[PDB]
Enzyme design. Sequence first.
Site, PDB file in Angstrom:
ATOM      1  N   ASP A 155       0.865  -1.180   0.000  1.00  0.00           N
ATOM      2  CA  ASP A 155       0.000   0.000   0.000  1.00  0.00           C
ATOM      3  C   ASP A 155       0.896   1.222   0.000  1.00  0.00           C
ATOM      4  OD1 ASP A 155      -2.366   1.414  -0.124  1.00  0.00           O
ATOM      5  OD2 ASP A 155      -2.798   1.272   2.022  1.00  0.00           O
TER       6      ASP A 155
ATOM      7  N   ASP B 237       1.931   2.004   7.968  1.00  0.00           N
ATOM      8  CA  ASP B 237       0.779   1.274   7.436  1.00  0.00           C
ATOM      9  C   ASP B 237       1.173   0.135   6.559  1.00  0.00           C
ATOM     10  OD1 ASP B 237      -1.699   0.357   6.910  1.00  0.00           O
ATOM     11  OD2 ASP B 237      -2.519   2.220   6.024  1.00  0.00           O
TER      12      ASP B 237
HETATM   13  C1  LIG Z   1      -6.348   0.041   2.610  1.00  0.00           C
HETATM   14  N1  LIG Z   1      -5.216   0.075   1.674  1.00  0.00           N
HETATM   15  C2  LIG Z   1      -5.605   0.242   0.260  1.00  0.00           C
HETATM   16  C3  LIG Z   1      -6.431   1.541   0.157  1.00  0.00           C
HETATM   17  O1  LIG Z   1      -5.824   2.586   0.932  1.00  0.00           O
HETATM   18  C4  LIG Z   1      -6.575   1.926  -1.314  1.00  0.00           C
HETATM   19  O2  LIG Z   1      -5.327   2.257  -1.847  1.00  0.00           O
HETATM   20  C5  LIG Z   1      -5.159   3.628  -2.213  1.00  0.00           C
HETATM   21  C6  LIG Z   1      -5.652   3.652  -3.648  1.00  0.00           C
HETATM   22  O3  LIG Z   1      -7.031   3.343  -3.704  1.00  0.00           O
HETATM   23  C7  LIG Z   1      -5.423   5.039  -4.212  1.00  0.00           C
HETATM   24  O4  LIG Z   1      -5.679   4.967  -5.622  1.00  0.00           O
HETATM   25  C8  LIG Z   1      -6.974   4.749  -6.131  1.00  0.00           C
HETATM   26  O5  LIG Z   1      -7.865   5.740  -5.657  1.00  0.00           O
HETATM   27  C9  LIG Z   1      -7.580   7.082  -6.067  1.00  0.00           C
HETATM   28  C10 LIG Z   1      -8.544   7.969  -5.175  1.00  0.00           C
HETATM   29  C11 LIG Z   1     -10.024   7.787  -5.470  1.00  0.00           C
HETATM   30  N2  LIG Z   1      -8.225   7.583  -3.790  1.00  0.00           N
HETATM   31  C12 LIG Z   1      -9.112   8.171  -2.774  1.00  0.00           C
HETATM   32  C13 LIG Z   1      -7.696   7.188  -7.579  1.00  0.00           C
HETATM   33  C14 LIG Z   1      -6.751   6.171  -8.237  1.00  0.00           C
HETATM   34  C15 LIG Z   1      -6.886   4.766  -7.659  1.00  0.00           C
HETATM   35  N3  LIG Z   1      -5.822   3.862  -8.132  1.00  0.00           N
HETATM   36  C16 LIG Z   1      -3.938   5.414  -4.126  1.00  0.00           C
HETATM   37  N4  LIG Z   1      -3.678   6.731  -4.722  1.00  0.00           N
HETATM   38  C17 LIG Z   1      -3.474   5.398  -2.670  1.00  0.00           C
HETATM   39  C18 LIG Z   1      -3.679   4.004  -2.094  1.00  0.00           C
HETATM   40  N5  LIG Z   1      -3.152   3.947  -0.712  1.00  0.00           N
HETATM   41  O6  LIG Z   1      -7.052   0.841  -2.102  1.00  0.00           O
HETATM   42  C19 LIG Z   1      -6.454  -0.454  -1.946  1.00  0.00           C
HETATM   43  C20 LIG Z   1      -6.397  -0.876  -0.478  1.00  0.00           C
HETATM   44  C21 LIG Z   1      -5.755  -2.260  -0.392  1.00  0.00           C
HETATM   45  O7  LIG Z   1      -7.726  -0.933   0.099  1.00  0.00           O
HETATM   46  N1  LIG Z   2       2.974  11.251  11.846  1.00  0.00           N
HETATM   47  C1  LIG Z   2       2.490  10.009  11.874  1.00  0.00           C
HETATM   48  N2  LIG Z   2       1.212   9.796  11.561  1.00  0.00           N
HETATM   49  C2  LIG Z   2       0.862   8.508  11.686  1.00  0.00           C
HETATM   50  C3  LIG Z   2       1.631   7.448  12.121  1.00  0.00           C
HETATM   51  N3  LIG Z   2       0.888   6.277  12.126  1.00  0.00           N
HETATM   52  C4  LIG Z   2      -0.283   6.646  11.687  1.00  0.00           C
HETATM   53  N4  LIG Z   2      -0.363   7.992  11.415  1.00  0.00           N
HETATM   54  C5  LIG Z   2      -1.524   8.778  11.014  1.00  0.00           C
HETATM   55  O1  LIG Z   2      -2.671   7.967  11.128  1.00  0.00           O
HETATM   56  C6  LIG Z   2      -3.300   7.814   9.839  1.00  0.00           C
HETATM   57  C7  LIG Z   2      -3.905   6.447   9.765  1.00  0.00           C
HETATM   58  O2  LIG Z   2      -2.835   5.523   9.957  1.00  0.00           O
HETATM   59  P1  LIG Z   2      -2.850   4.213   9.033  1.00  0.00           P
HETATM   60  O3  LIG Z   2      -1.895   3.065   9.521  1.00  0.00           O
HETATM   61  O4  LIG Z   2      -2.610   4.608   7.617  1.00  0.00           O
HETATM   62  O5  LIG Z   2      -4.351   3.709   9.229  1.00  0.00           O
HETATM   63  P2  LIG Z   2      -5.241   2.608   8.556  1.00  0.00           P
HETATM   64  O6  LIG Z   2      -6.149   2.031   9.524  1.00  0.00           O
HETATM   65  O7  LIG Z   2      -4.297   1.451   8.089  1.00  0.00           O
HETATM   66  N5  LIG Z   2      -5.977   3.265   7.249  1.00  0.00           N
HETATM   67  P3  LIG Z   2      -5.582   3.180   5.658  1.00  0.00           P
HETATM   68  O8  LIG Z   2      -5.061   1.741   5.322  1.00  0.00           O
HETATM   69  O9  LIG Z   2      -6.693   3.449   4.759  1.00  0.00           O
HETATM   70  O10 LIG Z   2      -4.412   4.222   5.327  1.00  0.00           O
HETATM   71  C8  LIG Z   2      -2.179   8.097   8.870  1.00  0.00           C
HETATM   72  O11 LIG Z   2      -2.685   8.530   7.626  1.00  0.00           O
HETATM   73  C9  LIG Z   2      -1.471   9.242   9.570  1.00  0.00           C
HETATM   74  O12 LIG Z   2      -2.300  10.389   9.546  1.00  0.00           O
HETATM   75  C10 LIG Z   2       2.992   7.686  12.483  1.00  0.00           C
HETATM   76  O13 LIG Z   2       3.783   6.877  12.973  1.00  0.00           O
HETATM   77  N6  LIG Z   2       3.345   9.013  12.289  1.00  0.00           N
HETATM   78 MG   LIG Z   3      -3.773   0.626   6.175  1.00  0.00          MG
END
Ligand SMILES: CN[C@@H]1[C@@H](O)[C@@H](O[C@@H]2[C@@H](O)[C@H](O[C@H]3O[C@H]([C@@H](C)NC)CC[C@H]3N)[C@@H](N)C[C@H]2N)OC[C@]1(C)O
Ligand SMILES: Nc1nc2c(ncn2[C@@H]2O[C@H](COP(=O)(O)OP(=O)(O)NP(=O)(O)O)[C@@H](O)[C@H]2O)c(=O)[nH]1
Ligand SMILES: [Mg+2]
Length: 301
Positions: free
Chosen positions: A196, A215
């Site tokens: 991710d 993450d």
């Molecule tokens: C929870 N982890 C990811 C989730 O965060 C999400 O991943 C996003 C992913 O969805 C996102 O890209 C999608 O969504 C973009 C936008 C609608 N994100 C809000 C548009 C392009 C499209 N490829 C990326 N820019 C960032 C990425 N972290 O989708 C897959 C997943 C396995 O569920």
């Molecule tokens: N500065 C900082 N922010 C953190 C850290 N861990 C988490 N965060 C904050 O907490 C948010 C959510 O953490 P994350 O692990 O991505 O959560 P999640 O449950 O896996 N959500 P998702 O998979 O959609 O990103 C991050 O986007 C960031 O804002 C860290 O070690 N440092």
């Molecule tokens: Mg996550």
Amino acid sequence: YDDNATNVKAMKYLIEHYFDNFKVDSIEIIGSGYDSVAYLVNNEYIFKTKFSTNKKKGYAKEKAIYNFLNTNLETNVKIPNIEYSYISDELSILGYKEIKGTFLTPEIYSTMSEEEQNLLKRDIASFLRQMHGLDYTDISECTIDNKQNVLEEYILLRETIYNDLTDIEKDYIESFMERLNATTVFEGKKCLCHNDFSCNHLLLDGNNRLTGIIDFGDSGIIDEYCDFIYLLEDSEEEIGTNFGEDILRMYGNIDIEKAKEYQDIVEEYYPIETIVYGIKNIKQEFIENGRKEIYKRTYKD
Ligand SMILES: CN[C@@H]1[C@@H](O)[C@@H](O[C@@H]2[C@@H](O)[C@H](O[C@H]3O[C@H]([C@@H](C)NC)CC[C@H]3N)[C@@H](N)C[C@H]2N)OC[C@]1(C)O
Ligand SMILES: Nc1nc2c(ncn2[C@@H]2O[C@H](COP(=O)(O)OP(=O)(O)NP(=O)(O)O)[C@@H](O)[C@H]2O)c(=O)[nH]1
Ligand SMILES: [Mg+2]
Ligand SMILES: [Cl-]
């Protein structure tokens, strides 16, 4: 925020209940996901939390991955290091010291000097090289087969809402499946990937150098190409295709055209993935969003 600040209060209660000697002086919501909420506690700790969820065993794997990496990685790049964990079907919490820094964005990248950008790219490639190079025997259970997962997701569609879809929706799906069947991009190296690896998970220090990565909640042993998918992405949220290309060249020993084909295939899949999520979690809005996105993509050029 709430009138009762109810969410923060419940979570404060839970943290102090499950972590015997832990005292919450401050607590605020710092992020949220589809079914998760993240909190900053005492201005020092991150607590990721979730209630009952479709992907059970989720925070357990993520924990096991942090532990595997903190043991085995040799890097100056910080990653979560889990000090507190509570894991059950109905509630999971992971707590770790907040990694300090600023999240990479397109805007910030645009202000960096060419050399700063290069170094960031080098740091990213070097981290990915090290992680993908680990002997993953000790986490050999954390395996993810994306092709197979998609094939099983397609079957779920066929068993649920497929017959109610429009022809246009069906054609989009079948056209993707034909592509999935013909591609060779799953036949390459498998390794531990972050999976991710987008810029909202990358932290910069005051010199715009890579200081941390967060993450690893989707991490596992999967195609090496996976970790380049968002680096290659052209969108408002990501830096751009050239960023991913350069990183691939620095990383080396990888077929770039195949990495791009992989990314392009996953992008095509996104609306379908979104539909599937809606089916599995019983959230109609996701089903509707995905279907609509299929129409937007169909009518693009
Ligand atoms: C929870 N982890 C990811 C989730 O965060 C999400 O991943 C996003 C992913 O969805 C996102 O890209 C999608 O969504 C973009 C936008 C609608 N994100 C809000 C548009 C392009 C499209 N490829 C990326 N820019 C960032 C990425 N972290 O989708 C897959 C997943 C396995 O569920
Ligand atoms: N500065 C900082 N922010 C953190 C850290 N861990 C988490 N965060 C904050 O907490 C948010 C959510 O953490 P994350 O692990 O991505 O959560 P999640 O449950 O896996 N959500 P998702 O998979 O959609 O990103 C991050 O986007 C960031 O804002 C860290 O070690 N440092
Ligand atoms: Mg996550
Ligand atoms: Cl619908």
